[PDB]
A paper describes a structure:
In the nucleus of the infected cell, influenza polymerase (FluPol) uses the viral genomic RNA (vRNA) as template to perform synthesis of either capped and polyadenylated viral mRNA (transcription), or unmodified anti-genomic copies (complementary or cRNA), which then serve as the template for vRNA synthesis (replication). [name] is required for both vRNA to cRNA and cRNA to vRNA replication. First, it stabilises the formation of the replication complex, an asymmetric FluPol dimer comprising a replicase, which is part of a parental RNP and synthesises the genome copy and an encapsidase, a newly synthesised apo-FluPol, which binds the 5’ end of the nascent RNA replicate to nucleate formation of a progeny RNP.
Focussed refinement on the separate replicase and hANP32A-encapsidase moieties further improved map quality to 3.21 and 3.13 Å resolution, respectively, allowing a relatively complete model to be built, with the replicase core being similar to that in the CORE-ENDO(R)-1 structure. The [name]-627(R) domain behaves as a rigid-body part of the encapsidase in focussed cryo-EM refinement, which is explained by its interfaces with [name]-NLS(E) and PA-C(E) domains. In the distinct encapsidase conformation, the PA-ENDO(E) packs on the [name](E) fingers domain, but has only low-resolution density. The flexible PA-ENDO(E) 51-72 insertion contacts the top of the [name]-CBD(E) (e.g. residues PA/55-57 with [name]/I461, 469-471, K482), which is not rigidly integrated into the FluA replication complex either. [name]-N(E) residues 138-226, which include the helical lid domain, are not visible in the map, having apparently been displaced to avoid clashing with the PA-ENDO(E). Finally, hANP32A/K153 also makes interactions with [name](E)/N711 and PA(E)/E493, which are stabilised by PA(E)/R495 and E293 in a network of polar interactions. Another major point of contact is of the PA-C(E) 550-loop, which bends to be able to interact with the concave β-sheet surface of hANP32A.
Author numbering:
A (entry chain F): 41 to 137, 227 to 744
B (entry chain D): 1 to 63, 73 to 716
C (entry chain E): 1 to 184, 207 to 227, 240 to 633, 656 to 669
Write the structure that this text describes.
Amino acid sequence: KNPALRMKWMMAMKYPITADKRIMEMIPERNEQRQTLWSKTNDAGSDRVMVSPLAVTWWNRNGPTTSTVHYPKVYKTYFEKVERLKHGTFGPVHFRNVYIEVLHLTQGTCWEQMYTPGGEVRNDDVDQSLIIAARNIVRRATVSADPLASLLEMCHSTQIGGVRMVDILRQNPTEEQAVDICKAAMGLRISSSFSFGGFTFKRTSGSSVKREEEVLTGNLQTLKIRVHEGYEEFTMVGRRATAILRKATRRLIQLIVSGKDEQSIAEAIIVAMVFSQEDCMIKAVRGDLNFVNRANQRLNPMHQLLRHFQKDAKVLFQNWGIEPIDNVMGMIGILPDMTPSTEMSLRGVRVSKMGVDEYSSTERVVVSIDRFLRVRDQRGNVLLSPEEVSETQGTEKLTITYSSSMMWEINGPESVLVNTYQWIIRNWENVKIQWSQDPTMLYNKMEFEPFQSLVPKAARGQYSGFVRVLFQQMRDVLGTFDTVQIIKLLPFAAAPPEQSRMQFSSLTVNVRGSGMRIVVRGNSPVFNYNKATKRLTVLGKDAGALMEDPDEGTAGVESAVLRGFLILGKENKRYGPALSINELSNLAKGEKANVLIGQGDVVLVMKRKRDSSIL
Amino acid sequence: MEDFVRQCFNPMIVELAEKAMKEYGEDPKIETNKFASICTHLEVCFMYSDFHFIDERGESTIIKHRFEIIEGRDRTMAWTVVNSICNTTGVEKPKFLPDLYDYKENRFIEIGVTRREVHIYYLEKANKIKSEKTHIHIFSFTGEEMATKADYTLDEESRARIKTRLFTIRQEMASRGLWDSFRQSERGEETIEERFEITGTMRRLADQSLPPNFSSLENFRAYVDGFEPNGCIEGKLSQMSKEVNARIEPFLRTTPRPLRLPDGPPCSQRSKFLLMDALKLSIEDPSHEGEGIPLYDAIKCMKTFFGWKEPNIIKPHEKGINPNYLLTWKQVLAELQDIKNEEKIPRTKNMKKTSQLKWALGENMAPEKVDFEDCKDVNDLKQYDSDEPEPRSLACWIQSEFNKACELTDSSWVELDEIGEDVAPIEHIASMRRNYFTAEVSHCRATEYIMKGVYINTALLNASCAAMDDFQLIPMISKCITKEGRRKTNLYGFIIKGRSHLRNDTDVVNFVSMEFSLTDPRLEPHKWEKYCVLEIGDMLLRTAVGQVSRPMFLYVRTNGTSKIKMKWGMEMRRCLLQSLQQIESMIEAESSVKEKDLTKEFFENKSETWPIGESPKGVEEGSIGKVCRTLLAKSVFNSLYASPQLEGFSAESRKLLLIVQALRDNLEPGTFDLEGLYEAIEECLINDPWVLLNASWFNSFLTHALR
Amino acid sequence: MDVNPTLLFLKVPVQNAISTTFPYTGDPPYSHGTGTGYTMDTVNRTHKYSEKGKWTTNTETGAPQLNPIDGPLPEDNEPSGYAQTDCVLEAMAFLEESHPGIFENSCLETMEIVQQTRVDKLTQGRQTYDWTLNRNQPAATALANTIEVFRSNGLTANESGRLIDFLKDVMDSMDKEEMEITTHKKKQRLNKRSYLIRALTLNTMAIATPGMQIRGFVYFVEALARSICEKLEQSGLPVGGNEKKAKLANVVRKMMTNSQDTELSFTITGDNTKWNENQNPRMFLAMITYITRNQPEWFRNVLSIAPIMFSNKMARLGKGYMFESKSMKLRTQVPAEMLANIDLKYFNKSTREKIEKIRPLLIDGTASLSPGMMMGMFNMLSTVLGVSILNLGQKKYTKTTYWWDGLQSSDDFALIVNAPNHEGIQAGVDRFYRTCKLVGINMSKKKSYINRTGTFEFTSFFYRYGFVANFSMELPSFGVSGINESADMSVGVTVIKNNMINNDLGPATAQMALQLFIKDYRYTYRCHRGDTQIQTRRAFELGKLWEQTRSKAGLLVSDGGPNLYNIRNLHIPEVCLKWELMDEDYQGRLCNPMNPFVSEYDAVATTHSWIPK
């Protein structure tokens, strides 16, 4: 309490700072504006003079510079924190309830949020960038109108680190679920092994045939499955869990899995159980399974069962049964409570130390692509799909750009604004023609969907109505075109407008919580236009360049600033003194005034005699 | 010296050492050698318990950690871990806190490092601690190592590594030229016999501090030392009175009754400013010369009105000075005109001392100071009137006050700065919740009240602490942003503070506040008892039959505020945080049962109905928006009406709510003393209107839920 | 149609919306509960609950004393301060039996800290009574004055710097017949009785603050009590938030799941309001002597000095009273030193009755209060007693079909009782009530309720079907601490982070706290973002910086740059958070060691860190 008020009041005076006397003979006696940067008074009880924080800012902005040495080496503690945070990743958050400085994120009131910090380890820049880009593209395309064509458009309309991603895809042998799905959609060759349950399944012995079986679940729900009959030998490959599995006709006989931690081993074991197509787990199904992705589209029953088991499997472990175990070198058991045991283990699931690892394969196959990106090989088994794509997201060692129409809402609201205006400026000719001819379709363009999110819901229909009326006036008046205004104001009209009487002098866009304001007339921090250089700046980030179209009024009048009114340029003292925007509601048709639009400039305006209508 | 330890030792070990010494309350700056000693001890313990694991068969494998650290944690965690280990393995409970625990050997090991010879340290440690089945690991910087029974759990490689670490550390101290101090600081902690004798006064006091039937402390010590329980509790309970018992009253649905409300004259407004009846003289967009200064803004806002009349009193202050309020209002207007006549107007203008100003403030009505010796012989000299205020009946105007406080305004009252981007999904959920709530409540009247109070209180405090002996004038300004997006500046009235020579935080400054309004105070005069009402103009308002003229009233009232109350009113922004916390807690409570982030369907769904009111046809629901606005309004009302009565009633009624809840879930509840709880709750319903309305809400909820 | 927030509970279970019922969530502005009449009523009630206790006259302070221990057993449900020594000792013995060695380990692990603490440890703490000046004073200045006076009086052993040495110095000074106080030159001679009464004072602006001669002994006894509690499971101290949340769930799981389906379980939540009336320092001394059985005598004396001294505690009486005459419009104030002999016509009926009750105790303007305790000095010992009472509820001790357990933290208590039938539950609750009454533990029947197991609360940790709703903390100040730009930023961001970690602060609420933080910081230091249109003198040069920098995000918030903090990134220092983004020239200028401005919290030694004039 006391310190805050004391500092607030102390900073008020002109010279609240105390500094050594040397500053007298090192910095100018005042500023370029003649402001004094010090005072001759000496601190009580010492020889230090009194100066002002303006001197602090002067030193910060144009003070003498020195070499930055001993700083990176001395601060060895917080730098590692920065590296771990930035190079770390994240994951799905579950509402149920290295790791010594992230406590708030990992644990909360009643939810858990996974996080794996970084450091300087792991794979290279190109592979990680490709994996993350493919993950984002696939995840967004999951919810598109048609994932296949949309995904192709995103892949062909994006690049990685200044290099088109198609070249990397064709010249990079990196393997990943998202990358493999993108390659399959592109029609190239993908790995024979099929990514299921988050791990790569590679067959290396045995075979089976597909049969359609109807099975009654433990919850009294009948599901149709494509059960495989015949001995098969699979290897589950994963970074933190590698396993070797045998399967037979509706029977699991052996599974040896090695993982760094118990969680990965448990995940691999659950994946093996679900892949085994055992009747016992069918009888162990509880509840109604309707798992869907962000697109709410129903998935195949196997994926739903896998998700249900991943949610929890405590009620299933004890149902398998009890069998004996033999003590062997490099052999570990699996208790029902998920704990290794020397004397006992869970049925048909063992744990080894080294496991099956090391050598990989370089085999590729020709595959076909179905409606919703579900990659299926010639045999019939599902190879890949977005349902099996991991949720991990990290950082990009090199800049990655996404010019598509649905990747904009990734870099942030500022990025959304900048990219919407970039799209508007890049398509200036076509957008102008559409606005002139059939603007109704333009106002329904999906490319403006992100902007509708930034504009508050409570004040988006009224904003849209104001914009529609203003643009109708601009169209029906003629002779007063102004491209900058059109680009600035177009995106706000997307909503289904409604009639209103407000005369908006500024519209609000929510960026990073704080709401910025863009003025209908003149320049705004959100939208700046420099006519001296003819450049548009959006929040300090360039958005493109504007070229004046074959319509313009270079002699005053501007009809798209005040609804129902036409501004006639410079003010005239002869007419009625400066009015108020609210008062303008009483002027008669054709009346003129000297309204004060804003800032410190007066503009003469005449009330439109006609009336511009909208749908 | 500590710089070397900080730079060499890894951050985690130094952080653990800092926490450990903070637990014992020892400052590292004063004690330097012990800092290095503790850091080395922790380092050697961790190395002893590093890169060691136990395989699933039982054999020792080097890559379930073989060694578990017990001294690397705090006392509570270490004690819990050792208790659990002993209970599970049935091992003899250690006397002290061991440094490490070996799982393969299932035994507790202690680590010791000394500057002097190892043998003396081992001997003293064994004599002090070792009594049965205990092992100590002893090392030193001299390169000589030994342990108990010549048994080392660590292999040759680990022992050599620890020896090399100690040797390189010793070489570092030798190079730095401070190893001599390190060695000399060690002395073995000579444990000379400690004597603490109670004698003289303390012996008498101790002898006079024993239970009955005891003559001296020594007799009691001997008695307790030889004490062994034998059925004393059972005997006392058998001989205890049967009437003593905590009986459970069967709590059914019919038992509860509504709280008995007090009877008497209706309540009255006591807020620092009007809430439902405030009036604003506003400028849509301040672009005039000299912006930012509250005085110029107030002058400009005043110039927008031309309906001034000759002031006259409609509803007078019954127990107060009516004419002087009028005189001081006239003085305010004349002083403003005089300021208008000036050219070089300073930042603020102090009103000249006048009779009416002093009388309205209360300076001339303030009792003087004199010692009790010179005023004892006074016929009516009594203790301050610490008498319980008279009961006041519930009045409907507070209900309307809250109703209008919960309505939706048409301006952006609160402006908040920016933060970083959100990358984690939990960050996305948090941003979504915050943005939804903010969009909901940013247009509520509660935010208007918050900003008005903050501005008034900050200006008043700055004026009070700026000029001590000046009766300054302070406009009541509030800056907002309309829906259209124009910076509106509203002026509600004026305040004049008294003398502000403040030395204590609780010192009371007296001010006189004049507030505009358009409510006729002859409709509910009882609501207005502390105010003097003047009619200082007429306003033209547009209605379906043109511009009708209605009177413009002014409420003048003398109030007092303390610096701590000023800060409390300057920190009302926390009402938004509290209201969020409430809605977020409800979100989490409803989500946990369903086990999924439910904010998306909580806010956007617009299919939920939370009972938030009542109507003639029955109860009424609303939206999550209505819920958020109601909670924020309740928080602001609680902040403005801060009184012990409110907290008392809330605390005593929360228990009744909980018991009713338990009744709803068929938990078969019971009450030991229901009437006592009822009396405790009703003790807080005497005169306050806010608490009375809360009690009325509680009675409505009681009569509705049990149906 | 008319707002009614309470009606929310008509569909939402109350436990979910409990925050609705916390009106303040802060420090109110009135400070109701401190004065003189409150002390009068406290003393009167303390001596009333010991009505039948034996009366005696003290020999050193020359004041009466009341001893209710072993008095007649209560016959009515009203509060009783008749705590039996034998029952307390039996309860402690049973606690030791169920937890063997606990007292032994506590003693042997605390002897070192008893022999290790330095004198400066007493500097940390709350306000202290300065016998030299006879008024509440900061601990540090009180210590300085005490050492100065003792040095003047030839008691300089405390110069060794050991806390035990200073305690011995205090013992010697108290043994002296009289001492001198030199204030600045005014000399005051305090006799043996005067000094003794001063040293046993309890000032009242932890409502009560003892003097300085009793700080170290209180600290030692509280350290032992904390050490004993640590080994105790039912004890609610000194754990934090997560462990406290887990305690309720663990207790419920233990009591319910293990129980048979036939058995019925119930839970009672109770508040031990006015918890210090019925607990006497003599019973605490008895339990302390029992704890240190077969231990070195010096340690026993050091540990037993505290309750011995407190049993003769003297309570000060507020600042006084204020009288006013409306007829003559006059105001006057009278001190408490003149309250012993003064007319009772000035006061009202209740106040004059209280004065009549407390008249025969005021010694030298300071009442004598042997029985009862004062808030917030021996809380851990009270928790120890409560956990002993709880431990006396096992199936082996009860020797009955029913049984019980629960938690106690000395301010709230919860008890789960289960039995084969409803009559069994009634018998269990009644037996617990009587047993806790015998020891002097008082359960308020007007603020306690019983319901089927699953839903209850403890220390505001409301529990419903495995869900805890911790509401035991208030929101701190998110403002400028007033040191410097980097210092304030670092301390405040660390504050919000720490509150998030433990105090159970929601993420969105943390985000708004950071928002208000940025607002207040920019307003106070006048360092606004370059893009913003706000105007001030500092905005001029600041503006220049905004133009010069090639990376806006690199600039520090104090320098006008954007605030990139968020939930994910809060622990990192602000300077380190923008290290790479900062332009090379800006980095060199900012952290120049040769700057003229420079001759806990985690921050970098930038030029923004200066000492205010």
